[PDB]
Write a protein that binds this DNA or RNA. Structure first.
Ligand SMILES: COc1cc([C@@H]2c3cc4c(cc3[C@@H](O[C@@H]3O[C@@H]5CO[C@@H](C)O[C@H]5[C@H](O)[C@H]3O)[C@H]3COC(=O)[C@H]23)OCO4)cc(OC)c1O
Ligand SMILES: COc1cc([C@@H]2c3cc4c(cc3[C@@H](O[C@@H]3O[C@@H]5CO[C@@H](C)O[C@H]5[C@H](O)[C@H]3O)[C@H]3COC(=O)[C@H]23)OCO4)cc(OC)c1O
Lengths: 760, 760
DNA sequence: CGCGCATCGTCATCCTC
DNA sequence: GAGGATGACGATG
DNA sequence: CGCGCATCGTCATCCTC
DNA sequence: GAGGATGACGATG
């Protein structure tokens, strides 16, 4: 009785023989954990140790079809390794002895990712074998997350709140050399030996008491308890907000040694952190509409200038190095590719430039090449969207004592209304279609005036399809068809979410031949597709055309598309989630949040210009004094020079003062009055400085004269000019994409008016 | 008759039916070529087009065992796709019609890599079916390498000599916008349409006339014609040297349209370039002993400072970006890993620092983690090995109008004698064992004195094994065994090339049990292996120990290792290959090449110090003149100031003069006399400058007084101090690697003296 | 260096007793 | 006792 | 994101009629 | 003619 199916399994010495109850099956996530286990178990033993590497997410068997259960080979092989039988109750001790193993130990990192794997495993086990949750069948192995060392003294920490309490309870901080442990590649064999030297500290079992815990086990895995999970997340968010406001430290686990672990606290304390993290990283906020990955990428791009092009794979490492990215490399490259996509039906305004094959509009749009095959370059719109002067507005986080990206940004327009926010998280989701960019400026101007803004319509770049709204939060999108002759027909325009391969396989194949129930509808079809436009030389029987007209062209060819927008939940500026009703309310909230910052920017600009103004004034006064002549330069000591500078009414460095009043808002400094070359002593330099000192005075007087209003329009004027330039470049690209072919012929076309089923 | 084995094959419409002679099978290297073909053939057609992607190198069937032929599944599937039969002659037209295809078109890039694939394919076909080389069975598809564009005017170029002739024949260079085409990811569908628009230009067939060409076909594929290939490479190298000396341009192919292609020119012109490139990139030179990949990595590392650590995957992109690396990413990361390995038996002096798991000495040393899992940091020895002042000695290449790495370097010691040169190329190879680093300094000192240097012995870091040389260019290496008791035995030291897993599987398993012919030799064994040391608690019958002693301990346990060093072929400073005889001759040649550069460095340093010396002298004179006072600073025009500076004997910028005399070796410049701040007018600055101007004079007088000799020893003194510091750090690491265990017990040990078989 | 299984939740079709 | 067969190998496809 | 086949040539074992 | 079943989906394992 031995396993020979997969070679990756570490067959134990007693796996299949005597002492089946003492056989231990270890599940290791990822693949580096397998190497760590092979390197570490060489000292402890090999008899009661069978290691199996894990791939990743586990298929949820609680809600799946019978065909779906037999799909993943690995899940099926788990039974072959263990020996489970669905139609047999494992209640008697002999039934437990029958199994090839007696205990299952799973090990994960201190991150929240392992919580999902543990929950999926508990679901897979309890869904068919609840009675096995009381016979010491499951246990857990843990790892450290951070270690401090000073003078050969090490301390173990397994929780971030534990580390925070250690910092709050110990004096002389920044003395213990700190070392983070984000992944498995950091640990070595010498550390694994110490890890396996103490089993009572890491090898911790579980405990089950009362059926009520099973309800919690079902809480995160029931499709009928969505509102219950919503209330659960709401209670947790309220508790966290109250604790942060009161400043009381939260609770954590693994403070001292533990033998068992209750399921109720296990669900209420560990998996909830993964749920909160997934929700924070999945859906963007309403202020800037940017996800944390896009935020890190854009911040790293802002860090440099990037005048020339740059590789994607090379940029991903630079982003991960400074943004503290700890989610592999594939996800970041995928996010960069999604930011790079700008074809029709995907986005309306990108932050990069299309260089290479970023996926066409024919086959899924995901047929792009390797990130190193393709190149990229920053766009010119980002400079106007995020002005650099806004760097002094938001407060950055402090991780690793490093200046990192902020929590959000302040754009000139809501990005959710221009690129769409499609986020799927726990408790809620977000799906907002695109709109027109030209109407946004008119709406903002009308709102600045104080009039009721007109209702908007979902628009797309390079899309001539009309959209009519019958019921609120519901939209119908149809394409355009051209009838050249009573026999020939051509589809002019396709609606959103229409891929060439999918539409072909789902429409042309059933219509071409006679299916099991439908006669062959079409007689001929051709696909002269260009890079962006489509062509359909399709022939049809004239008699069948009348029936198609009576039924409906959009109905027969399936050109109609219905969408509903109800999940208007976004992260507020504070951090809460509120289900919204209309777009205009979101625009008004953004307008108020933006109005709050005109005074802040004005206060930051006011006085800052005055600082350099006074500095130049003092420099000019020093030059005039030198022209008159009182300060002897004949090897005078610096002490007398500083004394004269103080006695003659010369202030210190204003830039130093503004820098000092930034963290929380010897003696005098006069380096700037002595770091000036002799070129200042020339006539031309003095003449140009005499007006350079007034060039700043003009702007200072204008700022003292101008109001906080009338600035948004002046800022938008340059943006509209740049947008017209970008549209001219797009028209030039269309001229480049012009082969020299003839224009589309005019033909009869109609749009069907679907009866309103009064849905919702 | 259809193919259903692999889904990757693009089944043609006529593949298996009528018109078998007209069926065309296309072989595409890599995987991007398959996407390019799918994107391009959509316009031309799909009936007579069957595309198959290629994996890479092809197994050589001309010299392989019968078992080896049936190993690669892809090679076997090639027959299933085509329909070849080994025991059937395809001479009659009906036999050609029987095959599923009539023509084979292969396409590769303009690089030399495709030449190897084409040669392997020609070998695979001709080895069993020569008669098929005369019936239009094979053809070729080509791609561009570079394109120029200006004012909507494009020109195609397929050869680097063609591009050189175009540059030499056309005026107004740097006007046509150039675009390189190194790989397949650069080309787009719009370019593929133009590529397939002209078949007569790219689709070129072949021609065979006379059996003599077959000899050339065998020349690059015969294991008995090694000397013939050596003469062939020698003739080509001599011809290239003569053509470069005479300045005559070489010959190239694809100048005009061609219908056929002779095999003789095909072998003598295209594959020879791949052979030369592989030979240039495989074996390092004798001057620095660094391969081009190591050279690019080290140059990129020199470009930056790298005070902190850095990732390997992140560094690889930065190396590829500046060094013009066009060989993927895996090879560069593998080269970095090889540079990072410093364990016993691999290297003696690395250029990096071990951070992470770089592979242990237990399982092949190739069990390291992902390049992003591990970190790296530059060592401190590189600063002394390659002084920055040597940057003005060698002339860098000019690729893409960019300053790139040089062709070689000038180290203080020959790297081949400290890290080994193991290169395998066409025509020759190189395998040089390691030696002792301490003896190199003594040998160099003795050579500088003028005495005959003592013979050296191959040494290794942390290796106590003795080596005795009986015959020249031959070495015997043995380990050490400890006999604790008449029954117990332990192996103290293992010889070079001894891996724990391999030695165990090849020695302990046959000795433990009774094999088909040998009784069980050992009775027990234990493996208490540490990170570096080994332990063997092995028991043996006392009676069998006497027989083992009579036969030989090194002989029975296979502890002896024999190696011969005969391939002493290295690239000379000129570029030629000369088979060397002894190491001392190599040391003398390196000593002469190094002596040639003392005068060059002295000439570069002489005058350069004088330039800043005169500059500081002029600055001090200007300060003294200002103390006396003649130059009025009252808004005087710059023209009068320049006139006074000229009339008072003040020279221009010497740094500008040295910069001008570097490429081939308004009016005056006085910016440095006016770019000085007022701090120079202070007493302390003047007092410190009065001695700073003489600090350079002291070194200048010392250089004028010192000789070109006595500099190498002074340079080596700091290097020996740093080497002692590095060895102290290694001893500190050994103290870190000290668990606290007891020392190895003293025991009887012996080294066998093998009889000399007088080999070679 | 291309190959491949899933998660959270929301919704458009869609088909049969 | 000697010649064909088996792997060691290091950059690249 | 780990999985896997080869090339150029040189040489150490190595084993059987 | 209505309710359970099937995929669309976007960041990560
Ligand atoms: C191999 O070893 C491990 C794999 C993984 C998974 C994974 C799992 C897979 C799988 C593929 C992958 C792969 O992701 C895939 O990338 C693809 C690239 O973008 C587009 C094309 O499509 C993506 C797939 O949607 C995604 O699934 C890995 C990337 O990083 C991960 O986290 C992924 O196909 C089969 O099951 C986790 C591990 O432990 C931490 C492992 O040890
Ligand atoms: C998948 O598609 C393609 C693959 C290739 C080969 C390749 C071929 C392989 C194969 C693996 C590989 C892989 O290299 C492997 O890296 C490994 C990593 O370092 C150590 C561990 O061991 C190396 C292998 O020795 C090497 O073989 C590719 C890396 O870049 C290449 O050039 C390699 O295993 C099976 O056959 C070329 C192509 O066309 C351009 C392709 O389209």
């Amino acid at each position: 009785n031995r396993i020979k199916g997969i070679p990756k399994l570490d067959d134990a010495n007693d796996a299949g023989g005597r002492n089946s109850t003492e056989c231990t099956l270890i599940l290791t996530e990822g693949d580096s954990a397998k190497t760590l286990a092979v390197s570490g178990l060489g000292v402890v033993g090999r008899d009661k140790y069978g290691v199996f590497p894990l791939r990743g997410k586990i298929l949820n068997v609680r809600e799946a079809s019978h065909k779906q259960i037999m799909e993943n080979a690995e899940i099926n092989n788990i039974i072959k390794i263990v020996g489970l039988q669905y139609k047999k109750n494992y209640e008697d001790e002999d039934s437990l002895k029958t199994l090839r193993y007696g205990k299952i130990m799973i090990m994960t990192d201190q991150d929240q990712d392992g919580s999902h794997i543990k929950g999926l495993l508990i679901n897979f086990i309890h869904h068919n074998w609840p009675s096995l949750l009381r016979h010491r069948f499951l246990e857990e192995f843990i790892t450290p997350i951070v270690k401090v060392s000073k003078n050969k003294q090490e301390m173990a920490f397994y929780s971030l709140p534990e580390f925070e309490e250690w910092k709050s309870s110990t004096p002389n901080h920044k003395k213990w050399k700190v070392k983070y442990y984000k992944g498995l590649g950091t640990s070595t064999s010498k550390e694994a030996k110490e890890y396996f030297a103490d089993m009572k500290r890491h090898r911790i079992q579980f405990k089950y008491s009362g059926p009520e815990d099973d309800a919690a086990i079902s809480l995160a895995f029931s499709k009928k308890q969505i509102d219950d999970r919503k209330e659960w997340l709401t209670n947790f968010m309220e508790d966290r907000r109250q604790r942060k406001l009161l400043g009381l430290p939260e609770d954590y686990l693994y403070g001292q040694t533990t033998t068992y672990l209750t399921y109720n606290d296990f669900i209420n304390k560990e998996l909830i952190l993964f749920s909160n993290s997934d929700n924070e990283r999945s859906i963007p906020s309403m202020v800037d509409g940017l996800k944390p990955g896009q935020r890190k990428v854009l911040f790293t791009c802002f860090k440099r200038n990037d005048k020339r092009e740059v590789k994607v794979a090379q940029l991903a490492g630079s982003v991960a190095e400074m943004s503290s990215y700890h989610h592999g490399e594939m996800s970041l490259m995928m996010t960069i590719i999604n930011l790079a996509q700008n074809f029709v039906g995907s986005n309306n305004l990108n932050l990069l430039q299309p260089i290479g094959q970023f996926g066409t509009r024919l086959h899924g749009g995901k047929d792009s090449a390797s990130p190193r095959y393709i190149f990229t370059m920053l766009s010119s719109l980002a400079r106007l969207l995020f002005p650099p002067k806004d760097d002094h507005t938001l407060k950055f986080l402090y991780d690793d004592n490093q200046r990192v990206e902020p929590e959000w940004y302040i754009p000139i327009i809501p990005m959710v209304l221009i690129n769409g926010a499609e986020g799927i998280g726990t408790g809620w989701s977000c799906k907002i279609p695109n709109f027109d960019v030209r109407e946004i400026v008119n709406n903002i101007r009308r709102l600045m005036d104080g009039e009721e803004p007109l209702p908007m319509l979902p628009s797309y770049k390079n899309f001539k399809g009309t959209i009519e709204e019958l019921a609120p939060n519901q939209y119908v999108i149809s394409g355009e068809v051209a009838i050249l002759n009573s026999t020939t027909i051509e589809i002019s325009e396709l609606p959103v979410r229409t891929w060439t391969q999918t539409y072909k396989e789902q429409v042309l194949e059933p219509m071409l031949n006679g299916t099991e129930k439908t006669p062959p509808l079409i007689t001929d079809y051709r696909e002269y597709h260009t890079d962006t436009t489509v062509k359909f030389v399709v022939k049809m029987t004239e008699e069948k055309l009348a029936e198609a007209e009576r039924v409906g062209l959009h109905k027969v060819f399936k050109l109609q598309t219905s969408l509903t927008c109800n999940s208007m939940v976004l992260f507020d500026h504070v951090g809460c989630l509120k289900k919204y009703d209309t777009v205009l309310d979101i625009l008004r909230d953004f307008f108020e949040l933006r109005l709050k910052y005109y005074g802040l920017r004005k206060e930051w600009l006011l006085g800052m210009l005055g600082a350099e103004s006074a500095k130049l004034n003092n420099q000019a006064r020093f030059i005039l004094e030198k022209i008159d002549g009182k300060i002897i330069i004949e090897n005078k000591p610096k002490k007398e020079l500083i004394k004269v500078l103080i006695q003659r009414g010369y202030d210190s460095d204003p830039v130093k003062a503004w820098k000092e009043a930034q963290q929380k808002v010897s003696g005098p400094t006069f380096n700037y009055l002595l770091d000036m070359p002799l070129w200042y002593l020339t006539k031309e330099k003095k003449d140009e400085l005499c007006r350079l000192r007034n060039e700043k005075e003009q702007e200072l007087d204008t700022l003292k004269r101008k109001s906080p209003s009338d600035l948004w329009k002046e800022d938008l004027a340059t943006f509209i000019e740049e947008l017209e330039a970008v549209e001219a470049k797009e028209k030039q690209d269309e001229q480049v994409g012009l082969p020299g072919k003839g224009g589309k012929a005019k033909g009869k076309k109609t749009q069907m008016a679907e009866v309103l089923p009064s849905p919702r």
